[PDB]
Amino acid sequence: IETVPVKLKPGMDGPKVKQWPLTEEKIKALVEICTEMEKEGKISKIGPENPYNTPVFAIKKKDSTKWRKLVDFRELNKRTQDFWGIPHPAGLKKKKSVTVLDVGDAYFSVPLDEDFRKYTAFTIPSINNETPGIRYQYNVLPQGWKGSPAIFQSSMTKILEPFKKQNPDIVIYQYMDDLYVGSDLEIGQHRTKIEELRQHLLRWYELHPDKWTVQPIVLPEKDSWTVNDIQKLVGKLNWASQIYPGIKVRQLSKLLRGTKALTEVIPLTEEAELELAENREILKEPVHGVYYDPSKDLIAEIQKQGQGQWTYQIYQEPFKNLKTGKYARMRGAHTNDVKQLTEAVQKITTESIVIWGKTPKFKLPIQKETWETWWTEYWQATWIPEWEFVNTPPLVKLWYQ
């Protein structure tokens, strides 16, 4: 009920980001929703003396036909003062199950700092520029802004105090508009406990981190190797030598002596099998001196394997993976690559939030224009990670498969 004074970083003006084109249906949804929000005192119409603007569009969450309003507060977030720090619950990723909840409805109670409101300005765009866009600014706490959960941390603490004093074994984390609840219960007991917590929040996505672990580097096991097989093996091992100290390939490359046809079978010598075995033993061990630096950015690279299969690696320094994975999940996306990529980025970002507490910077295997054209049509998350575009085909693609 009381507004806490919020400012910006020294030497940084408010966000002035271009509003991108929207389809007619999304514009209608935004008009209706923002009308309703205006009638509820959540947002208010502003004059032209407000030069700031933040992009806004509409989506549809999982198992819901109701349109939702999403704001790209990225620029505003990076221009918003660094809010100060609760250490990330490292026990969250170690829990058997974790449920994601959308507590965004609770933010619209706390009013926003009057002086800061002009920075949350946004515009609903008109079709064919026939009429000037509708301009709004937030009066309460806007969903997506990094300052909102920071301001609502105390309130959320006072609200969730009885539940935490009741079930101390249930880990609770909060990121943006999302609330993560980790437990070791049973899926039925889990769902009932989630109903209990959500009604607990009322009167005031089912993830399984235990099924998500880290994957190693494996080598093929054959009875008869071809020249091509041994060549690929040597390439993979040579690549892996950047990550592991003792990988040697001289005895395997010794087999490739002479010019043989790629499909010709070569029997492995004893030294070669010994070397391969030693390399396996080395690969079974974890990587040497791999740590997480909270002061550095997280980098997430994604490779398209095909047939719905995607691979990803999260790291900070090259050849020092903090996380590896393979998104093979198929829902409704069979004929669409960009949709699959979007869902993959969402999941990876989610896991990144669970593990480290922040979002990574993606390196996407897609042309800038394609992604920029279609990524909003399949986005369902309330947060938005950073990304860049790699337009040169990586050779390492089949080395993670």
- Out of 153, 199, 373, 401, name the contact with another protein by CB under 8 A: 373
Q: Would you state the structure tokens that stand for residue 396, as one six-digit string?
A: 């390492």
CB of 52 to another protein, least distance (A): 8
CB of 263 to another protein, least distance (A): 5
191's CB contacts (< 8 A; 6+ apart) are: none
- CA dist 247 and 276 (Å) reads 9
Answer whether 359's CB lies under 8 Å from 386's CB.
yes
Answer yes or no whether residue 215 interacts with another protein by CB under 8 A.
no
- Out of 135, 198, 200, 358, name the contact with another protein by CB under 8 A: 135
271's CB contacts (< 8 A; 6+ apart) are: 251, 254
Strands (E) across 189-346 are located at: 206-207, 225-226, 265-266, 299-306, 309-315, 321-327
CB of 312 to another protein, least distance (A): 13
184 is in an annotated binding site: no
Answer yes or no whether residue 264 interacts with another protein by CB under 8 A.
yes
177 is in an annotated binding site: yes
Answer yes or no whether residue 324 interacts with another protein by CB under 8 A.
no
113 is in an annotated binding site: no
Answer yes or no whether residue 246 interacts with another protein by CB under 8 A.
no
Choice between 356 and 371, CB closer to another protein: 371
User: By CB under 8 A, what part of segment 273-312 binds another protein?
Assistant: 304, 306
The angle at the Cα of 397, spanning 392 to 399, to the nearest 5 degrees, equals: 140
Closest CA to 249 of 280, 218, 223: 280
Answer yes or no whether residue 9 interacts with another protein by CB under 8 A.
no
CB of 349 to another protein, least distance (A): 17
Answer whether 120's CB lies under 8 Å from 31's CB.
no
CB of 306 to another protein, least distance (A): 7
Choice between 249 and 354, CB closer to another protein: 249
Answer whether 15's CB lies under 8 Å from 79's CB.
yes
Name the segment binding another protein (CB under 8 A); options: 32-40, 109-117, 167-175, 332-340. Answer: 332-340
The number of beta carbons lying within 10 Å of the beta carbon of residue 274 is 12
Answer yes or no whether residue 367 interacts with another protein by CB under 8 A.
yes
- Out of 60, 61, 79, 397, name the contact with another protein by CB under 8 A: 397
Answer yes or no whether residue 159 interacts with another protein by CB under 8 A.
no
Secondary element (H or E) of residue 156: helix 153-166
- Out of 75, 102, 278, 337, name the contact with another protein by CB under 8 A: 337
Answer whether 245's CB lies under 8 Å from 279's CB.
no
Annotated binding site: 102, 177-178
Feature table: binding site for Mg(2+): 102, 177-178
